[PDB]
Design a protein around this nucleic acid. Sequence first.
DNA 1: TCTTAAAATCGAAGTTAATATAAACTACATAACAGACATAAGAACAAGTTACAGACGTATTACATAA
DNA 2: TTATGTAATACGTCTGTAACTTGTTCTTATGTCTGTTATGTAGTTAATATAATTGAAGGATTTTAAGA
Lengths: 50, 71, 49
Amino acid sequence: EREEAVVWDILDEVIREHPVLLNRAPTLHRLGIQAFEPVLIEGKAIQLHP
Amino acid sequence: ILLRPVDDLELTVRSANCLKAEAIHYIGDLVQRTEVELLKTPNLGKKSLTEIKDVLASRGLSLGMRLENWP
Amino acid sequence: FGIDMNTDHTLEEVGKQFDVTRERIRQIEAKALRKLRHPSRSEVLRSFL
DNA sequence: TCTTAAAATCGAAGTTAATATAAACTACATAACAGACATAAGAACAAGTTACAGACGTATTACATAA
DNA sequence: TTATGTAATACGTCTGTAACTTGTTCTTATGTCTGTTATGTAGTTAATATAATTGAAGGATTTTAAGA
């Protein structure tokens, strides 16, 4: 909650190679949900590969 | 460990009694004194001293080191 | 206190364990309490405040 | 074999946070709330019972001194 | 050489501390009984009066049972 730095290093280590699932509605086919490796970025928006 | 008070050593009431009677309050004050200086304390006998030695040696410490500029 | 046990017990049936004496049970429990209060074996419990 | 009324269905997320009309008196039994008392449980003090510690006193041996 | 007398030394030990334990004694929290008030239930009223009720609405297609 206090958002210390070591929390940020721990977060990097947990997300190091943990894939996440991205989805967009409507899910017309199975390509509407795909797994990506996350890269932590400053901001509030998800960056998507073109 | 050098910054904990004497009671942390968990001394027998006889021991803690004696060392509180000589105003020996800090483990530095325990170590800078020697065995003969403690054996001269009234009511501090040989077996009391040996159990002090055992318990203090449990914590990686011993009697008689010289601590500079204590405290 | 009833740890790992279905019911809590008062001094009576705690005495009923070996010797049925009240003040000895109280003094034993108080000795155990100040022994646990010792800062050397209570840091792991102080974190739960 | 041909009308004719029913029955069922009709994309995902996302957000979203409600209202609003329209018998009285009497009699009885029961439940709830408050107060006081007795009881069981704990806190406090003091005593007794017991072994061990801590330094002293003693006993023993060896060195020194005296004959 | 040997009695003697001091001195180191090791072992009992008398006493001071402390642990274990009980008596008992006082205090308090709780459970219970009892008395009083509010709540909840129930019964009755005697000009005469005698077939609701309120909406609601541009649907478009299929399939499947009743009626003839």
